[PDB]
Amino acid sequence: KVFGRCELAAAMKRHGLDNYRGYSLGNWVCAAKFESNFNTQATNRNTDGSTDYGILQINSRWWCNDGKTPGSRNLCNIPCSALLSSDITASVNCAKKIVSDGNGMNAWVAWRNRCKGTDVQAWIRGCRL
């Protein structure tokens, strides 16, 4: 389902992602834009036999379980398939855990590349929230 910036921004604010840890909404909506382009259903394979799932592209080696990745730690303790739903809660709950490992949002390739050090509050400019 392709979310749309301020619709996603509202849903994420509601789910406590505004200043979660100390990252304002714009970071999360930014990551969601460059990781998945707001499409909940997005999957992508990586070079080790693991796939990235959903809107926040949480990977199956470390974070969720998809029944076929070698080395599955499944830290978020959720089936990866649950991350593909049109309501972002299993993805937001797993995202809260990823941030809590003492590495911040660096865990997200596209937040790093396209959102670290940018004016991330542009991502909610003109959004009702």
């Epitope: 259903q41 999957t43 070079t47 080790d48 076929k68 070698p70 398939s81 593909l84």
Partner: antibody, heavy 115, light 106 residues
Framework: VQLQQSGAELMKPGASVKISCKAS????????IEWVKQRPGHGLEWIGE????????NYHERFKGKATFTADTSSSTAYMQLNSLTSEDSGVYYC?????????WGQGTTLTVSS | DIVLTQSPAIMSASPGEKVTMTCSAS?????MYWYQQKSGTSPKRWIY???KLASGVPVRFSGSGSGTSYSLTISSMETEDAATYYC????????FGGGTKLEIKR
């Protein structure tokens, strides 16, 4: 149950064909089904795959645009549509499973593209 | 992504003989998968996650390797191991090797 596929097809160049994979026997929604092409003489090519429950689809560079996968949740069927069929599309197409609970393959649908 | 090459193309072997076929990858792969095909039927996943034997593979098969060079080894060759064994890197976008046909010598 099984992974039962469609029978062989004969198609002209330019047309599009759709192949069924009736994957019955488990929670369909939950497991990726992969599709592979065997050109007798070249061997195997990996086309892509679909996770029927969400409809998340992953393709190999070479087939993004030649292939489209869909799944009908109510008949436990996955479909692979191959479009703009050319002579090089003739081959045996397999649907399969590659996970730790089961790794079954189907027998293949042979496709011949000729006039 | 990676190009995989299987040495050699066809091999002869008697029963009781030890067989090792090799699959090399043009760039490092994290794991390898071997499938067998008997002419007449679909491929069957034989070895997965480099060394794990799929359901029904006799224990006499083993897979090994790392980075670039991987292999499948049959200790006592038996007649029903005559097939083509293909290897595959199942990374960002999978590729299979050209196979190694195993036919028995008589």
């Amino acid at each position: 149950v099984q992974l039962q596929q469609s029978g062989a097809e004969l198609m002209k160049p330019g047309a599009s064909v759709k192949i069924s994979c009736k994957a019955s026997g488990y929670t369909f929604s939950d497991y990726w089904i992969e599709w592979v092409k065997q050109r007798p003489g070249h061997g195997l090519e990996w086309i892509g795959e679909i996770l029927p429950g969400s409809g998340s689809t992953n393709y190999h560079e070479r087939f993004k645009g030649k292939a489209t996968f869909t799944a009908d949740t109510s008949s436990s069927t996955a479909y692979m549509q191959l479009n703009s069929l050319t002579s090089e599309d003739s081959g045996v197409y397999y649907c399969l499973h590659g996970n730790y609970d089961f790794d079954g393959w189907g027998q293949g649908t042979t496709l011949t593209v000729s006039s | 992504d990676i190009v995989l090459t299987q040495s050699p193309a066809i091999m002869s072997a008697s029963p009781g003989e030890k067989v090792t076929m090799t699959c090399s990858a043009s760039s490092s792969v994290n794991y390898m998968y071997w499938y067998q095909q008997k002419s007449g039927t679909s491929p069957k996943r034989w070895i997965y996650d480099t060394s794990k034997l799929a359901s029904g593979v006799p224990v006499r098969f083993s897979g090994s390797g790392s980075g670039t060079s991987y292999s499948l080894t049959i200790s006592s060759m038996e007649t029903e191991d005559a097939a083509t064994y293909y290897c595959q890197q199942w990374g960002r976008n999978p590729t299979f090797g050209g196979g190694t046909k195993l036919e028995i010598k008589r």
